[PDB]
Amino acid sequence: MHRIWLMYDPRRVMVALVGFLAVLALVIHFVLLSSQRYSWIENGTLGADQAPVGASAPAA
């Protein structure tokens, strides 16, 4: 599998990888920070049973 570094310059791929991971990490954190369940800056000290839960089926 090491032959793929002949196919792509690692000096390019390392920058692209770090950029991809940095974006993905920021996206996931801000998606969670925008949620109610995981808005940890305001509600992080709530216990798991105290944490919000999205609405369930009314079984109507």
- Comparison of 29 and 37: residue with beta carbon closer to ligand V7N: 29
Sign (positive/negative) of CA torsion 33, 39, 44, 50?
negative
For residues 7 and 3, give the distance between their C-alpha atoms in angstroms, rounded to a whole number. 7
Any known ligand binding at 2? no
Among positions 1-60, residues that touch other proteins (CB under 8 A) are 1-6, 8-12, 14-16, 19, 22-23, 26-27, 30-31, 33-58, 60
Chain residues binding ligand V7N by CB under 6 A are 1, 3-4, 7, 17, 21, 24-31, 33
